[PDB]
């Protein structure tokens, strides 16, 4: 499997036409602060293709 191709799975809002976003800021899904790391109901925004 080639897992070196990433796509954005989580984002706070939608993109505008031809807008670029290559940030790695973690996404908070729950109401509990993730403290900018990872863990309970918060994830790294990028996902790999198998």
């Amino acid at each position, epitope marked *: 499997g080639n897992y070196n191709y990433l796509y954005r799975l989580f984002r706070k809002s939608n993109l505008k036409p031809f807008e670029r976003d290559i940030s790695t800021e973690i*996404y908070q899904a729950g109401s509990t602060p993730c403290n900018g790391v990872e863990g*309970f*109901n918060c*994830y790294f925004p990028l996902q790999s293709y*198998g």
Partner: antibody
Amino acid sequence: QVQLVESGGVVVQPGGSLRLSCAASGFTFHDHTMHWVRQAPGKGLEWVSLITWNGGTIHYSDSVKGRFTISRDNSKNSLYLQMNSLRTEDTALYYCAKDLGRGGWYLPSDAWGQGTLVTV
Amino acid sequence: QSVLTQPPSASGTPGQRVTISCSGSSANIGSNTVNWYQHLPGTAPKLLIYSNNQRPSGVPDRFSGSKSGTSASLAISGLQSEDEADYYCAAWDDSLKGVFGGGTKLTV
């Protein structure tokens, strides 16, 4: 093309020590948290346990806490569940499932295995 | 014999819209997010809704939901004969661990 394949769904004497094994492919294994969920016949879904990618934390439902052990091997892309002190109440279709994203964790997401039947 | 509470069944005429409710404590819904699953008999369960109202790839806009107060609900519009499945409510507990509801049987 994510797949999860369970094995070990056999009929076991309650006094035994059956282990289940889930093979995983089609996604990054070593960065993802995984869960076990079981469905007893005639009932709904019952959550069993989770293990995070780095082994940083493990959680068990009280009904299996202290009697089940969850472990993973990131070099084999496989998840294991050891179930001891078995009860007839443990008869269920056991499913292997993964979380939504990398690093963190919450509940089983979109990719579920076919599961295998454990009879006690 | 579950923490999250759901009705035993739901029904309606194809083309109509129905809702499936889910209730629990502040430790289940009030302080956490609710996920929904659609389990079609004969195969594995699949995620339908996550984080209250988000959809995974492959799930159409006929499936939506919300969370308010200490309760949550799933709305299924455009009922199809292929949606005759058991819908499950789930959340992470503050005292316990992972929690699933009884499951609501939706029928034509």
